[PDB]
C-alpha cells in the first residue's frame, strides 16, 4: 500500500543461514519503521519486532546523548583473502568474523589485516555444542578475541563454556553466569525505549547490533546506541554493507569508522526496485500486531 511496502532484497553472500532480507516498510506520523523478522518467528515472537516498527513509524525515539556511534566490520563467512579485503575497506578497527556458517584462517586473515591494536569478535550464531565451543575458541584465542558471540545455542551451554574459556562470552544471564556482554537488537527487543530498559536490568556491558535490515531499520539501531550510557564495544550496525541494495538515496553507510545519527529518508526509485507484493507480509504483520496487542 501507500504505507506499508514490502521489499526482498539479495544479500552479497549467505550469512547466518539467509541470502535474501525480506521485510516491510511502515510509514507512520514520525518517519519510517521497519518490520523484518526473519521466516521461522511466529507471532508472538513477532510482536516485539512489530512494536519497534511502530516505535520508529509512530512514536520517535529517545534524544541522542551523542552524534555519531562507532561500528565494527561485519565479516561473513568468505575466503581469508576476501575477509582481508573486507576488512581492509571497512574503516573500522574492530570486525566480528562469522564461523560456523576454513574458520581458523579467516580469523587469522583479519587479525592480520587489523594489525595487533585492532578488535577481533566472533560471530558463531548458537552452532556450537558446549564441547566443540571449547576446542574451537582454544583454538581461534591466539588471535586475541575481544570477545565471542553467542558460542552454543542455551544458557546452560553458555555457562559451561564460560567456566572453561578465558575469553569474554557475549549473549538472567548474568544470574546464570552465561555472559560477560549482553547483545541488543532493537527489533526484536520490541524497539529502542525496551533495548535501553533491558540494558539497565541486564547488569552487564552492552553491545548493539543489527538484524540486517535496510537503513530504516538500522537507523532505529543507531537511535539505540545513541542513547546508552556508553558504548565500550564498536555497535554491528555496518551490516547495509552486506545487501546488494537499500531504500535510501542517502544510505546509512559508515565512514572512518563510524555511522551519524540520523533518521533516513526512503526512496521510491530505490524501494521499488527491490519491492514484492505485500499481501503476505501484511498477514504476517496482522498477526504479530494482534500478538502485541494483546
Same mark, same amino acid.
Given at each position: 500500500?501507500?504505507?506499508?511496502? +514490502? ?14 532480507? %525480506? ?7 514520525? /518517519? ?22 511502530? %516505535? ?20 561473513? +563467512? !568468505? ?7 573486507? *576488512? ?12 560456523? %556458517? ?7 586473515? !583479519?587479525?592480520?589485516a587489523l594489525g595487533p591494536r585492532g #578488535? ?43 567456566? #572453561? ?17 549482553? *547483545? ?7 524497539? !529502542? #525505549?525496551?533495548?535501553? #530498559?533491558?540494558?539497565?536490568?541486564? /547488569? ?8 540486517? %535490515? ?7 539501531? !543507531? ?20 545487501? &546488494? ?10 565512514? &572512518? /569508522? ?21 499481501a503476505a507480509w501484511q498477514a504476517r504483520?496482522?498477526?504479530?500486531? +494482534?500478538?502485541?496487542?494483546?
Open positions: 500500500s501507500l504505507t506499508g511496502r +514490502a521489499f526482498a532484497i539479495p544479500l552479497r553472500t549467505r550469512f547466518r543461514g539467509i541470502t535474501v532480507r %525480506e521485510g516491510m516498510l511502515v510509514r507512520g506520523a514520525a /518517519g519510517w519503521g521497519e518490520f523484518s523478522p526473519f521466516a521461522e518467528y511466529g507471532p508472538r515472537e513477532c510482536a516485539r519486532w512489530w512494536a519497534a516498527c511502530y %516505535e520508529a513509524a509512530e512514536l520517535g525515539w529517545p534524544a541522542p546523548v551523542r552524534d555519531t556511534v562507532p561500528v565494527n566490520a561485519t565479516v561473513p +563467512a !568468505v575466503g581469508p583473502e576476501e575477509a582481508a579485503r573486507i *576488512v581492509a575497506s571497512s574503516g573500522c578497527t574492530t570486525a566480528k568474523v562469522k564461523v560456523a %556458517e576454513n574458520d581458523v584462517a579467516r580469523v587469522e586473515a !583479519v587479525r592480520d #578488535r577481533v569478535r566472533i560471530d558463531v550464531n548458537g552452532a556450537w555444542d558446549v564441547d566443540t565451543a571449547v576446542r574451537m575458541i582454544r583454538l581461534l584465542d591466539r588471535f586475541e578475541l575481544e570477545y565471542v558471540e553467542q558460542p552454543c545455542a542455551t544458557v546452560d551451554e553458555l555457562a559451561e563454556v564460560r567456566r #572453561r574459556v578465558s575469553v569474554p562470552i557475549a549473549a538472567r544471564v548474568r544470574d546464570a553466569e552465561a555472559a560477560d556482554v549482553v *547483545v541488543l537488537k532493537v527489533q526484536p527487543l520490541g524497539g !529502542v #525505549r525496551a533495548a535501553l #530498559r533491558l540494558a539497565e536490568e541486564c /547488569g552487564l556491558p552492552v553491545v548493539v547490533s543489527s538484524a540486517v %535490515e535496510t537503513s530504516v531499520g538500522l537507523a532505529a539501531g !543507531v537511535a539505540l546506541a545513541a542513547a546508552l550510557p556508553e558504548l565500550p564495544y564498536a555497535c554491528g550496525l555496518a551490516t547495509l554493507r552486506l545487501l &546488494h541494495a537499500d531504500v535510501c538515496d542517502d544510505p546509512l553507510l559508515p565512514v &572512518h /569508522g563510524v555511522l551519524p545519527v540520523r533518521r533516513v529518508d526512503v526512496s521510491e526509485q530505490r524501494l521499488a526496485e527491490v519491492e514484492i507484493d505485500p504483520l496482522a498477526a504479530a500486531r +494482534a500478538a502485541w496487542e494483546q
